[PDB]
Design a protein around this ligand. Structure first.
Ligand SMILES: Cc1cc2nc3c(=O)[nH]c(=O)nc-3n(C[C@H](O)[C@H](O)[C@H](O)COP(=O)(O)OP(=O)(O)OC[C@H]3O[C@@H](n4cnc5c(N)ncnc54)[C@H](O)[C@@H]3O)c2cc1C
Length: 391
């Protein structure tokens, strides 16, 4: 087996990169450890930046999104008995965000790929990368007990947070930046109409709550919980009661509840690795960095990493300008750090932290009061939320 670009992982990063490359005539093979079904079971993201939307259109997979996607022009933040709407369109200069689930985006990409006939190997076990610094790197894996070898020119590590790619860069070459938060998000997906046309982020004394959606008849809700919690200790009944407790009364009373389709706990963390490449290997998406969900940037950062990698591979293959690939990490890290700073800020002003003194509580409240009450303050939230420009 030989291909031009080997891609590890068939989550949205690998699929999006594989689609863009296939359409430009660059052959690629995607290797995925799990089954299509398993990948399709991950709920995750709900909010997309315009840059991700345009990239899906460029990859030719935007029909259903254009049809089913909900374009949002504002978001709301509730705190201390107040509800403040941030007009994203006005304050960002016409930009907006699109609500379309990650499950959907993935489904759409998996379909486009199957129809194009590009190679995809699910259940590829024991993936190992070799000769990363040579001119001929290769990937080895096993399918049906047989160990196959895949020869290629470049390898894109799009295997997420628990992937094998990042582990393949010499530890003495990497710089890891990390921060773990003392809480997670308990999410509940229900077949009910959302309580609001726009999202509502809520800072409440009992802890954070978020009212999101997937469509007009499908909702996604979250509440902040301690890392010590087990999803089995949270019945649907218990979740709805807690959620109602953390929302403004007028919002809590319009809430249509119902049984859950999905329920899980996602712990929060920030994680950056530098550089994002080694020899013929380039990391993308969660494989290289993690942001807490508060700012809705994870999938959106994978999109810009992929857009950057794709464009640099085009130059190398099409224009014989392979030296440009050395700039991969520099370009990506600039956008990554700004998104990390925003996700960190959002997380710190909206959540309840354990062991927090009186001065800090007061400062947290004042941050919200200032930023939501100043025209310049609102613009900083909005321009960051819709997403900063791609380089
Ligand atoms: C609760 C929550 C809410 C979120 N909300 C948002 C949102 O609203 N907006 C937003 O932008 N982001 C959000 N995100 C983040 C977003 O879900 C992720 O950043 C995105 O899933 C990452 O895409 P990826 O392709 O890099 O990785 P993944 O989705 O993790 O896929 C990586 C793939 O690699 C495969 N793999 C793993 N190891 C191997 C191996 N050894 N060999 C082969 N394959 C392997 C995996 O099975 C997986 O299929 C949210 C995340 C969560 C958890």
């Amino acid at each position: 087996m030989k291909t031009q670009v080997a891609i590890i992982g068939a989550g949205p990063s690998g699929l999006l990169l594989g689609q863009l490359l296939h359409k430009a005539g660059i052959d690629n093979v995607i290797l995925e450890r799990q089954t299509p079904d398993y990948v399709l079971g991950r709920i995750r993201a709900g909010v997309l930046e315009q840059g991700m939307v345009d990239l899906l259109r460029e990859a030719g997979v935007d029909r259903r999104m254009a049809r089913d996607g909900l374009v949002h022009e504002g978001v709301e933040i509730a705190f201390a008995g107040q509800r403040r709407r941030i007009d994203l369109k006005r304050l960002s200069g016409g930009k907006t965000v699109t609500v379309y689930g990650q499950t959907e985006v993935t489904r759409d990409l998996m379909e486009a790929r199957e129809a194009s006939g590009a190679t995809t190997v699910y259940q590829a076990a024991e993936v190992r990368l070799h000769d990363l610094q040579g001119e001929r790197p290769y990937v080895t894996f096993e399918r049906d007990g047989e160990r196959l070898r895949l020869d290629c020119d470049y390898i894109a590590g799009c295997d997420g947070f628990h992937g094998i790619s990042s582990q393949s860069i010499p530890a003495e070459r990497l710089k890891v930046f990390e921060r773990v938060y003392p809480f997670g998000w308990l999410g509940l997906l229900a077949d009910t109409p959302p309580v609001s046309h726009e999202l509502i982020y809520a800072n409440h004394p009992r802890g954070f709550a978020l009212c999101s959606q997937r469509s007009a008849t499908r909702s996604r809700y979250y509440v902040q919980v301690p890392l010590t919690e087990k999803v089995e200790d949270w019945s649907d009944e218990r979740f709805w009661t807690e959620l109602k407790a953390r929302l403004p009364a007028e919002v809590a009373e319009k809430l249509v509840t119902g049984p859950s389709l999905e329920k899980s706990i996602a712990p929060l963390r920030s994680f950056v690795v530098e550089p994002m490449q080694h020899g013929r290997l380039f990391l993308a998406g969660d494989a290289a960095h993690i942001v807490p969900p508060t700012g809705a940037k994870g999938l959106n950062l994978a999109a810009s990493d992929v857009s950057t990698l794709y464009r640099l591979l085009l130059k190398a293959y099409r224009e014989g300008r392979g030296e440009l690939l050395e700039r991969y990490s520099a370009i990506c890290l600039r956008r990554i750090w700004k998104a990390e700073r925003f996700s960190w800020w959002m997380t710190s002003v909206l959540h309840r932290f354990p062991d927090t003194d009186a001065f800090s509580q007061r400062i947290q409240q004042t941050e919200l009061e200032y930023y939501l009450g100043s025209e310049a303050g609102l613009a900083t939230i909005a321009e960051n939320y819709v997403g900063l420009p791609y380089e």
